């Protein structure tokens, strides 16, 4: 259905405020792949409509949250996005661990997981957070549409659904199994991309120079027209003044997030 | 990259490579590119005293 | 910015210290676009 | 292609904030160039526009006869979208629809909107 | 804005053409040289469809046996051969400045 017949559990996460224990905003799981900082979680803890809420699991009584008080950070605090079932959308930087915690009257609630969260940033300028302009490149980044796409994850009873988790046993009396989908799954799209700034290009008899001048590291690639290509790939951050000798058979050169310019040599 | 005369003068002379792009759709905004100044540059990459 | 909707500009030469001006054809190319104009083209906008 | 279909109650008790939903079946809401409204039709008073949203980048765009009152929304997690009305009156009995736009390629977009939903009829009334 | 749509209806003659105008306040036609209309027709028990948007331009899905044209403000539909199927109503409808209002309807039969 959709869905109204799950359960969210509790389980073991290493951390919980003292020590370990038994967790209701455990992590099954952390995907951290895709371009610009999107992060999808797998919790033992539900989310929903009754508006966005969170609904989990406490010493077999069933609780409730907004998901204004959840915060979730991982270096740096996280901005939640979307939740859905036991998954939910975030907008995370790098780091090496995800936290995640509240608080009810009096007690604070948390889990963390060490799992390696990893900004991928588009194109050839590698930033840390995205800009606020530049030119737009192909990106797939963990999307917000939570329908049907073709990806589903186990569950069975024991009344209520409950996960096929690592975390928990299997029952004995009967094996009766179930699929759900996972929303949220990584599609494409187009995305912002920064623009270094213009290099610079001196002329010389049968040569090049680029004084170049960024921002943050960016690469420079560079190539012969000919049968000896002679690839010259760099990373740069510093400014740099770089010669390269170019002939009437031909050079081209791509810096960051610009197009490829041909440069051909003369007499 | 800023060459004034006097530091109260009228005049300075920028030149910061600075180039403007084309916006996208969604707001009002002015994009540009330009140079990392040289004040700093040369401020982080100069020698001793 | 200097915006107008279905419109066509012309930019006015300030004489500031690397005065860099130019003219975008195709922006903000609707309404629901940003600068609440009709067009689809022809949204004029002038940078400076 | 996109079946769209529509929701809410009906006899919504007069001087109250009415609402309904408007869900598209098996189609994106955050997709540009498709803007989704919103349109009645009173005993003889004819079809009207009340408002829309873009998919992406949704800012709204009302009517001012009734900007007072109305309200779009958007749910992206279950591809909705609805409509709420405060103060109804008592002449608004309707058939609310809701309507898709045509790829917006062009400034032809503006009115000529696309696949539907069946309808709801609304009786204000007690 | 409104704008008048006349006449209230016209049932005859299956088998021959028809037409129906519609008179705007201001004019539906902006500095970018487009006309600014679009015709709704809508069959009883469906909702509305379309068959002539921008005064003259037919729609995809649509039959041959229509045409329309206009000028500022005085547009008119024209219907090529009436057959059996197109009992219904017809609308005038406008886009050019919010709010969009529509025409008043139109009712054919035969």
């Known amino acids: 259905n959709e869905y109204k017949l799950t359960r969210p559990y509790m389980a073991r996460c290493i951390r919980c405020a003292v020590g370990s224990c038994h967790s209701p905003i455990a992590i099954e799981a952390v995907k951290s792949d895709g371009h610009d900082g999107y992060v999808r979680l797998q919790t033992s803890s539900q989310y929903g409509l009754d508006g966005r809420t969170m609904r989990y699991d406490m010493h077999g009584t069933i609780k409730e949250i907004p998901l204004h008080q959840v915060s979730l950070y991982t270096s740096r605090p996280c901005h939640i996005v979307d939740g859905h079932g036991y998954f939910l959308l975030a907008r995370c930087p790098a780091g090496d661990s995800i936290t995640m915690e509240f608080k009810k009257d009096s007690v604070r609630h948390s889990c963390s997981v060490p799992y390696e969260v990893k900004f991928n940033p588009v194109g050839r300028e590698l930033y840390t957070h995205p800009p606020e302009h530049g030119v737009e490149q192909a990106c797939q980044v963990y999307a917000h549409d939570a329908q049907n796409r073709g990806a589903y994850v186990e569950m069975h009873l024991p009344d209520k659904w409950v996960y096929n988790s690592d975390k928990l046993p299997k029952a004995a009396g009967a094996t009766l199994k179930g699929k759900l989908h996972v929303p949220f799954l990584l599609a494409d799209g187009k995305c912002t991309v920064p623009l270094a700034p213009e290099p610079m290009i001196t002329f010389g008899f049968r040569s090049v120079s680029l004084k170049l001048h960024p921002k943050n590291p960016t690469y420079l690639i560079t190539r012969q027209l000919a049968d000896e290509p002679h690839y010259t790939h760099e990373l740069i951050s510093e400014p740099a003044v770089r010669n390269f000798t170019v002939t009437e058979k031909g050079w081209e050169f791509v810096w960051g997030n610009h197009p490829p310019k041909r440069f051909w040599a003369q007499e | 990259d800023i060459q004034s005369r006097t530091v109260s003068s009228s005049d300075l002379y920028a030149n910061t490579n600075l180039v403007l792009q084309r916006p996208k759709a969604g707001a009002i905004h002015v994009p540009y590119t330009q140079a990392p100044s040289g004040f700093e540059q040369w401020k982080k990459d100069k020698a001793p005293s | 910015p200097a915006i107008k909707c279905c419109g066509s500009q012309e930019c006015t030469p300030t004489y500031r210290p690397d005065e860099q001006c130019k003219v975008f054809t195709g922006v903000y190319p609707f309404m629901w676009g940003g600068a609440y104009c009709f067009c689809d083209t022809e949204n004029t906008q002038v940078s400076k | 292609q996109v079946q769209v279909q529509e929701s809410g109650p009906g006899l919504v008790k007069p001087s109250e904030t009415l609402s309904l939903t408007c869900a598209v079946s098996?189609?994106?809401?955050?997709?540009?160039?498709?803007?989704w409204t919103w349109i009645r039709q009173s005993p003889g008073k004819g079809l009207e526009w009340l408002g829309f949203?873009?998919?992406?980048?949704?800012?709204?765009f009302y009517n001012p006869s009734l900007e007072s009152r109305v309200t779009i929304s958007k749910d992206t997690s279950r591809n909705q979208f609805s409509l709420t009305l405060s103060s109804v009156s008592a002449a608004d009995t309707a058939v609310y629809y809701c309507?898709?736009?045509?790829?917006?390629?062009?400034?032809?977009?503006?009115?000529?909107?696309?696949?539907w939903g069946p309808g709801i009829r609304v009786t204000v009334s007690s | 804005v409104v704008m008048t749509q006349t006449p209230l209806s016209l049932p005859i003659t299956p088998g021959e053409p028809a037409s129906i105008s519609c008179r705007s306040s201001?004019?539906?036609?902006?500095?970018?040289?487009?006309?600014?209309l679009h015709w709704y027709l809508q069959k009883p028990g469906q909702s509305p469809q379309l068959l002539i948007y921008?005064?003259?331009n037919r729609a995809s899905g649509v039959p041959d046996r229509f045409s329309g044209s206009g000028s500022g403000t005085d547009f008119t539909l024209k219907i090529s051969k009436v057959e059996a199927e197109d009992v219904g109503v017809y609308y005038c409808?406008?886009?050019?400045?919010?709010?969009?209002?529509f025409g008043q309807g139109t009712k054919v039969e035969i």
């Open positions: 309507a898709r736009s045509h790829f917006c390629s062009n400034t032809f977009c503006y009115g000529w909107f696309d696949v």
């Open positions: 098996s189609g994106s809401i955050n997709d540009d160039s498709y803007y």
């Open positions: 949203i873009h998919g992406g980048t949704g800012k709204s």
């Open positions: 201001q004019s539906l036609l902006h500095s970018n040289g487009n006309t600014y």
């Open positions: 921008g005064g003259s």
């Open positions: 409808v406008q886009a050019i400045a919010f709010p969009w209002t």
